[PDB]
Write an enzyme that holds these catalytic residues in place. Structure first.
Site, PDB file in Angstrom:
ATOM      1  N   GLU A   1       0.935  -1.207   0.007  1.00 26.64           N
ATOM      2  CA  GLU A   1       0.045   0.297  -0.057  1.00 26.64           C
ATOM      3  C   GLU A   1       0.767   1.277   0.131  1.00 26.64           C
ATOM      4  OE1 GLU A   1      -3.175  -0.838   2.981  1.00 26.64           O
ATOM      5  OE2 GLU A   1      -4.282  -1.198   1.004  1.00 26.64           O
TER       6      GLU A   1
ATOM      7  N   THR B   1      -6.755   2.413   5.599  1.00 25.21           N
ATOM      8  CA  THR B   1      -6.693   2.169   4.079  1.00 25.21           C
ATOM      9  C   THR B   1      -7.810   1.348   3.271  1.00 25.21           C
ATOM     10  OG1 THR B   1      -5.446  -0.005   4.163  1.00 25.21           O
ATOM     11  CG2 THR B   1      -4.036   2.200   4.122  1.00 25.21           C
ATOM     12  N   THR B   2      -8.782   1.132   4.209  1.00 25.13           N
ATOM     13  CA  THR B   2     -10.204   0.438   3.596  1.00 25.13           C
ATOM     14  C   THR B   2     -11.414   1.221   4.165  1.00 25.13           C
ATOM     15  OG1 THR B   2     -10.618  -1.152   5.573  1.00 25.13           O
ATOM     16  CG2 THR B   2      -9.048  -1.958   3.643  1.00 25.13           C
TER      17      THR B   2
HETATM   18  C1  LIG Z   1     -11.018  -6.135  11.405  1.00 18.32           C
HETATM   19  C2  LIG Z   1     -10.934  -5.770   9.929  1.00 18.32           C
HETATM   20  O1  LIG Z   1     -11.823  -5.424   9.338  1.00 18.32           O
HETATM   21  O2  LIG Z   1      -9.697  -5.519   9.520  1.00 18.32           O
HETATM   22  C3  LIG Z   1      -9.614  -4.995   8.434  1.00 18.32           C
HETATM   23  C4  LIG Z   1      -8.709  -5.662   7.400  1.00 18.32           C
HETATM   24  O3  LIG Z   1      -9.060  -7.167   7.247  1.00 18.32           O
HETATM   25  C5  LIG Z   1      -8.219  -5.092   6.042  1.00 18.32           C
HETATM   26  O4  LIG Z   1      -9.113  -5.180   4.969  1.00 18.32           O
HETATM   27  O5  LIG Z   1      -7.605  -3.996   6.228  1.00 18.32           O
HETATM   28  C6  LIG Z   1      -8.533  -3.004   7.053  1.00 18.32           C
HETATM   29  C7  LIG Z   1      -8.077  -1.507   7.147  1.00 18.32           C
HETATM   30  O6  LIG Z   1      -6.695  -1.472   7.997  1.00 18.32           O
HETATM   31  S1  LIG Z   1      -5.545  -0.737   7.612  1.00 18.32           S
HETATM   32  N1  LIG Z   1      -5.051  -1.137   6.359  1.00 18.32           N
HETATM   33  O7  LIG Z   1      -4.636  -1.137   8.788  1.00 18.32           O
HETATM   34  O8  LIG Z   1      -5.820   0.755   7.801  1.00 18.32           O
HETATM   35  C8  LIG Z   1      -8.961  -3.342   8.311  1.00 18.32           C
HETATM   36  O9  LIG Z   1      -9.784  -2.467   9.111  1.00 18.32           O
HETATM   37  C9  LIG Z   1      -9.437  -2.132  10.367  1.00 18.32           C
HETATM   38  C10 LIG Z   1     -10.833  -1.212  10.788  1.00 18.32           C
HETATM   39  O10 LIG Z   1      -8.873  -2.687  10.934  1.00 18.32           O
HETATM   40 ZN   LIG Z   2      -4.030  -2.986   6.217  1.00 15.54          ZN
END
Ligand SMILES: CC(=O)O[C@@H]1[C@@H](O)[C@@H](O)O[C@H](COS(N)(=O)=O)[C@H]1OC(C)=O
Ligand SMILES: [Zn+2]
Length: 257
Positions: free
Chosen positions: A103, A195-196
């Protein structure tokens, strides 16, 4: 809903989540010659000795290894961080090819994958409250390059067969996240976001300078996972990364010269 394909991918997120075009979005390109060494940064303290892993889950966007965060068992402190951040889960983003998957980028270079160790600020009591705060989360990001195998990663690789499709989970106790760290804790740091979706702007990013190496056989097994649920047509889980966003009014600090 949202995903990583042509019709629901990063280019589309802003319609449901307008913060996608916000003031402090992640990830970003780390321009190593623009980052400022900051001697006032305290040493980074990663204390994972009492880490308690519980479960590994395919949620249709990535897979997560989840941790017991009911106590200060595995915490991140120091560096740019004020107070104590508890480990809640880690997950990865990766590509369809070895030349893409990360990313964050480093001087525009993409790595084969990126590991994220997500921690939340204990002052806010729970993860849900923390994501609503500008300093609610600290995510430790580690780049993966393809080379020799990472022994500490293999236990994760071995269990992916059992969580191939969306919604599947498996017991994953007694895993030690310390086996995923490179030798050096030198890092860059900046204020950013998840990032999501929901893309909340609640993250202090700490991105390690030194990549870990994983084998081609290891990353190949990541690419055998599915975005889809069981009994649906196969869509390989690959390229689940958001591209670099505008840095805008932010400065990236470095812990090293
Ligand atoms: C538990 C879950 O859905 O975890 C998520 C995960 O599985 C992923 O899609 O990545 C997301 C974004 O996290 S990041 N890249 O460190 O900003 C997560 O969201 C969250 C809220 O942790
Ligand atoms: Zn992530």
């Amino acid at each position: 809903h949202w995903g990583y394909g042509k019709h629901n991918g990063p280019e589309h997120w802003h319609k449901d989540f307008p913060i996608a075009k916000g003031e402090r979005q992640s990830p970003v390109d780390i321009d190593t010659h623009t980052a400022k060494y900051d001697p006032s940064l305290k040493p980074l303290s990663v204390s994972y000795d009492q880490a308690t892993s519980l479960r590994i889950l395919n949620n249709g966007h990535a897979f997560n290894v989840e941790f017991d965060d009911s106590q200060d068992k595995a915490v991140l402190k120091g560096g740019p961080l004020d107070g104590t951040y508890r480990l809640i889960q880690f997950h990865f983003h990766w590509g369809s090819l070895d030349g893409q998957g990360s990313e964050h980028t480093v001087d525009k270079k993409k790595y084969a994958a990126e590991l994220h160790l997500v921690h939340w600020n204990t002052k806010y009591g729970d993860f849900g409250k923390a994501v609503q705060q500008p300093d609610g989360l600290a995510v430790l990001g580690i780049f993966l390059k393809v080379g020799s195998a990472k022994p500490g990663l293999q236990k994760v690789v071995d269990v992916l067969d059992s969580i191939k499709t969306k919604g599947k989970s498996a017991d994953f106790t007694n895993f030690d996240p310390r086996g995923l760290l490179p030798e050096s804790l030198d890092y860059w740091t900046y204020p950013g976001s998840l990032t999501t979706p929901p893309l909340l702007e609640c993250v202090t990013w700490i991105v390690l300078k030194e990549p870990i190496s994983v084998s081609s056989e290891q990353v190949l097994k990541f690419r055998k996972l599915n975005f889809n649920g069981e009994g649906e047509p196969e869509e390989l889980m690959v390229d689940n990364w958001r591209p670099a966003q505008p840095l805008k009014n932010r400065q990236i600090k470095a812990s090293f010269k």
